[model samples]
Target: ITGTSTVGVGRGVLGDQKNINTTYSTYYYLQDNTRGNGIFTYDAKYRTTLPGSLWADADNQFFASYDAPAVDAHYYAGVTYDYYKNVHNRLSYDGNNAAIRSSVHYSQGYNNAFWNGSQMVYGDGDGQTFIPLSGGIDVVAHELTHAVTDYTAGLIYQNESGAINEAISDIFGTLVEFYANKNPDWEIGEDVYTPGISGDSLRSMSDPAKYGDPDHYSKRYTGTQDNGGVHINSGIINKAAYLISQGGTHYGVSVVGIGRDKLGKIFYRALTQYLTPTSNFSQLRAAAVQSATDLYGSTSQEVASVKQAFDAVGVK
Candidate 1:
């Protein structure tokens, strides 16, 4: 889209009004030129395609029901980009202001979103288990965070390494949710999951067991499902992160909360500086401890909390 960059008014899947970056040629294209190379959004048109056509609107106003997911996807990607930049001083997912592209309105009854190696994709949900997934800021960030991981740690997507990968996404996704400050909580996907239900979410960092996920390493799932229980085992690490930030006693192990800023700093440092493709749970603990030691000190409370949190989760 080679034209003047402009802003368009739109309502998201949640029926909230906001402005979106768009490009205007003959049509107002959902190609935001405001960030990186650009943030291009596409439409999948109920088919299983990679990146579909660039969403074009006759007017610059996006209000139709079909346009809702695109609105949120485009807007929230920008917000996530801003979070990585402003909070971590990192550029885009690649730390080089790489362009962020996304596709919404995917296959019919599709109920998921992902980074897809090169770009972001969102499903329109079957309306039973989910709605438009991009509507959830955390969901969007969680998927995009995979892109960040791909560019940095390149964590192997299986076994313990995979669990660390998943947990890293959850951690940053939760942080981005709070950074945006819109009804933020430790619960993931509460906004777009089960529109009919009000009090539950896809997962809980505060208490992973609420959804049958283990908060301790001893209870970790060893089955070969979910990439060796990547999503399941992530609870162990997620709980440690939660305890480090918010403080809690799990299985008689107590961790004094250190607050969110430090939690983000320590984890961000670990992710960008120390974590690798095959790093497992114990390695993650070491990385976090070393990261805290680098940022704070060897004997600092931040470092101690990192150790205590890992210990509380039985990661030793």
Candidate 2:
């Protein structure tokens, strides 16, 4: 919403308590299998407005190239980074201080953006339908969330682990979008695609049914399509999360509204504090309930919504 500026604390995004000197533990992890400290290009989204860099490949576009994408990335990253600091007080991606890196213009005609272990990579849109994926708030949160998943729970990429990893990310990804846009209809990837397209989002939060799909998990337990259908099945957790935030009935159960921000706080606590790498749906439910209990107390309204919402997702 505002022009690109220096990335630092005191912008009302990162909390006032965040001193730049905050220390966090450090560790090594795979990042694209590429070598070196990871390249961080700056003036990212702004570079698009200036004379295109000779280094700029139509192949590799920048988030700063487009005004909106640059603005979106800045605020989105700020919000997510702040969420960690504000809620858990974790300095950054790692428990210890971790330097963050992001790259836009990932590949020519690339349609998606993802976190390849270390840095965030963004692809140029197909151009016909979708624009740059970097411009969206949830897109930024989703990419960075892969980092969060790696740090916490570290959900195994197999069946349950992969699904939980993807779902949890989607759950918070939608919240990040909501925090940024403050829209009541908090769907992920809604504005990334060009208008007049058949679909508005990669996934819907308000109504997965509008996409003509089951609003609940499939009983048959078929294998996933993408990385074991993690993307598709994430709808179960995403829908459950949305329902919980609204305090609506799910799985034929009644619920009280928990509000989106509060839901995120509880979910984050569960993912980070209670869950383990091997945790599954049942484990997630238990851990989330525990997290709610820890944060709000056993008899609090927050804990009640956590139980009902997890049940609404067929976790029972």
Candidate 3:
């Protein structure tokens, strides 16, 4: 809806109060036109339908409990957009600055979130398994990165390719969290995964094995579930990414940490220039090495660290 850009104040799902970007016509709406072309957030109204309604409020201030998810979804989407633009000089999910969209309160006690190809969808969790998922910045970034992957590499969503897809989301999601500096860590969905639990996350990049996810290629799942264990097997790649950024010794193999900026640069280059839709773990290893070479040269420490990190995860 065409409207005037405005600001609103609200408490997010986790009870954090902040000002949000909004638009005002007759009523205040959750449409932020500040980033890229636009970023629209909607209220799903506990239904299964998509992009339910442009979230509207009578006043520009949103302090009601029902508005918590909307606040987080809208604010976090902007944070994600800023991260991409400032960090990588990339515009939105596409290089063309496509308008970002999101729907919150999708389904009653839904307990999950997804990209759904074109836009983001967030579920109001069952309270035990999760709270409103948009409360987690990493979770929001993770889903949006799927859109980025679709636009760039178009990595197929099955088997090794699918795992790579998932890992890419996790990797950049963590990076975005760090970029925001909001209680940054390598844990995914820790903020909103389980409202009742503490110090536990949906997944861990620092030590994926803690959640029964593989940290090595030998432990990779070869199954038919989860799109050939995409979520599970992504641990291998997640571990490799962690090692590249932080350096670690795992399974008698060691890696030298090159830090996050270099790690992101190498991976972003690989995703945009080197990877294909069907690239596998071995192929990813090649792509990362080549990407590092392209960015830092064949004999550069960045390339050496990329090789060592993948080798530590047994990707070779």
Question: Per-residue CA lDDT of candidate 3, range 1-316, in tens?
Answer: 8988998899999888999889999999999889988999999999988979999999998889999998998999999999889989999999899999999999999989999978999999999999999999999999999999999999999999999999999999999999999899999999998777789999999999999999999999997999999999999999999999999898988899999999899899889898989999999999999999988999999999998999898888
Mark the regions of model 1 whose C-alpha exceeds 4 Å error after superposition. Answer: none
The runs of at least 3 residues in candidate 3 whose Cα sits more than 4 Å from the true structure, single-residue gaps closed, are none
lDDT, candidate 1, 1-316, per-residue tens = 7999989999999999999999999999999898988899999998888899999998999999989999999999999999999999999999999989999988899888888899999999899899999999999999999999999999999999999999989999999999999999999899889989889999999999999999999999998999899999999999999999999888888898999889999999998899999998999999999999999999899998898899998997
Model 2 over residues 1-316: C-alpha lDDT tens digits?
A: 1112222221211111121111111311111111122213223332333212212212111222343343344345656776666665776677664755665555566678777787676666777556777666677778778888899878887666677798787777777666655542556776676646755777776566665434566541456567666666666777777777887776688878888777888888888888888887788889888888988899999888887877776786
lDDT (C-alpha, whole model) for all candidates: 0.93, 0.62, 0.93
The candidate 3 region of ten consecutive residues with least summed lDDT is: 190-199
Model 3: per-residue Cα lDDT at residue 281 = 93
Evaluated against the true structure, the overall lDDT of model 2 is 0.62
Which candidate, 1 or 2, has the higher lDDT? 1
| Clash number by candidate, in order | 0, 15, 0
Residue pairs in candidate 1 whose N, alpha carbon or C atoms collide under 3 angstroms: none
Q: Model 2, residue 76: what's the lDDT?
A: 57
